[PDB]
Design an enzyme around this catalytic site. Sequence first.
Site, short mmCIF file in Angstrom:
data_model
loop_
_atom_site.label_atom_id
_atom_site.label_comp_id
_atom_site.label_asym_id
_atom_site.label_seq_id
_atom_site.Cartn_x
_atom_site.Cartn_y
_atom_site.Cartn_z
N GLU A 212 33.78 60.73 10.74
CA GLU A 212 33.17 61.95 11.34
C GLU A 212 32.46 62.75 10.25
O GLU A 212 33.09 63.03 9.23
CB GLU A 212 34.28 62.76 11.98
CG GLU A 212 33.79 64.07 12.54
CD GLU A 212 34.87 64.83 13.28
OE1 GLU A 212 36.07 64.37 13.27
OE2 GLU A 212 34.56 65.93 13.81
N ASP A 214 31.00 66.27 10.00
CA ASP A 214 30.89 67.63 10.57
C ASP A 214 29.78 68.38 9.82
O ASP A 214 30.04 69.11 8.88
CB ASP A 214 32.24 68.35 10.59
CG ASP A 214 33.22 67.66 11.51
OD1 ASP A 214 32.81 67.27 12.65
OD2 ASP A 214 34.33 67.45 11.08
N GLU A 217 30.17 73.33 11.87
CA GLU A 217 31.24 73.94 12.69
C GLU A 217 31.20 75.41 12.38
O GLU A 217 31.29 75.76 11.21
CB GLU A 217 32.59 73.35 12.38
CG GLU A 217 32.67 71.90 12.77
CD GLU A 217 34.04 71.34 12.48
OE1 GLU A 217 34.84 71.36 13.42
OE2 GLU A 217 34.30 70.88 11.36
N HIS A 228 34.66 63.46 6.86
CA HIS A 228 36.01 62.91 7.09
C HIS A 228 35.94 61.40 7.07
O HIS A 228 35.45 60.78 8.01
CB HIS A 228 36.55 63.33 8.46
CG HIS A 228 36.71 64.78 8.67
ND1 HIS A 228 37.95 65.34 8.70
CD2 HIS A 228 35.83 65.76 9.02
CE1 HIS A 228 37.84 66.61 9.06
NE2 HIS A 228 36.53 66.91 9.21
CO LIG Z 1 37.20 68.68 14.73
#
Ligand SMILES: [Co+2]
Length: 432
Positions: A212, A214, A217, A228
């Site tokens: 992932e 990100d 956010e 991640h």
């Molecule tokens: Co999350």
Amino acid sequence: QSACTLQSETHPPLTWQKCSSGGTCTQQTGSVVIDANWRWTHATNSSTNCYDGNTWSSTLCPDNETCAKNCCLDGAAYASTYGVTTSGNSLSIGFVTQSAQKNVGARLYLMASDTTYQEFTLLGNEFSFDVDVSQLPCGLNGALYFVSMDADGGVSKYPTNTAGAKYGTGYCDSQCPRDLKFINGQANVEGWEPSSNNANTGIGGHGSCCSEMDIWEANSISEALTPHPCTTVGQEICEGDGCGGCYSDNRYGGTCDPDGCDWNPYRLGNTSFYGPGSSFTLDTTKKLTVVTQFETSGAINRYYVQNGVTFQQPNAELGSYSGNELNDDYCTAEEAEFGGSSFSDKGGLTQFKKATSGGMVLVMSLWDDYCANMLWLDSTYPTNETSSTPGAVRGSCSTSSGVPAQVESQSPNAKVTFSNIKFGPIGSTGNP
Ligand SMILES: [Co+2]
Ligand SMILES: *[C@@H]1O[C@H](CO)[C@@H](O)[C@H](O)[C@H]1NC(C)=O
Ligand SMILES: [Co+2]
Ligand SMILES: [Co+2]
Ligand SMILES: [Co+2]
Ligand SMILES: [Co+2]
């Protein structure tokens, strides 16, 4: 799951731009699909629910295989049920939408065709988008991110899944979420535990892991950039508490890093960079351009544009590290100073580069946090720590902020608007 047609499914359209080195961007005619977990799940030959509130039908769903044989996903009323609307290159996601039922948030994927997600290979490219976070208070997360999902939503790997990407199947992320109702072409009724604090959700015996990225956010108070890694790059099922994530009994599971190597400028000590009004470098009451550059080294760079002014990611000093680049030196210094070994244990940016050198699917969502009230993003976390503890304070929000039931009552008309997505090689997305 199969697909049923009691409710019509059309993916709301959304344009984006693909950019070339040497100065040109071309319009792409995309669309978005809502994740399968938001949909009505019912019997293939009737309107009988397979899932009611937070409980599966023991009649239709005595086990994961029987349930998938018996049950289908149906179409979504994007505007009137889910508060999702588009205009040109703009996507708006509402927070609380009242119809026959209360809907909270949405998770959407960018489509290539009616049956396939758009895949992006991030490595060597940059991703630009505009965002309006002005209507996101404490406790809300307007997220734009990438996950290593299959383009067909799992149809080829798990041919019992005939619904596929058209119906938003195949989600995975570095939390290895166990709240998914269908994983790997089977239901998740085995080991289902209804949520104590959420009338609509639960946790099953299986979860769905993958890498992932990100990118974004954020709300009007705080923003974070976080890769991640996972030891399996793409989508893989996980067993019970081996999934980790906030909803397992321990968050450190066997294959994914749930924490990531996060870059939140506020957390890193620049408390005037991003926030509401004139006192911040970036004024979250106004639209913002966010540009994220995936260097061929596996490092990640960031700049912002607001009303035509470019701002590079602010400099951070953390241990021996000085710079504004998310690289293995930063991620190692962060573990040294703020603690933890999850990111390096799961292979760091070398492992993460396996994901960015492969296809990932674009996710846009709005959510509130039924596990930790978003305090990790915009408050003091853990709540017992102080601004005297480096990295404890990630934003100005109160430690009592972000309780879902509260923010849903306070701010139902909260929304995020994502717009003007541009993608191409590093240096290209400023092109006309
Ligand atoms: Co999350
Ligand atoms: C925060 O970042 C802005 C933009 O780079 C900069 O002008 C300001 O000096 C920084 N403040 C601190 C304390 O680092
Ligand atoms: Co199992
Ligand atoms: Co347990
Ligand atoms: Co300003
Ligand atoms: Co070094």
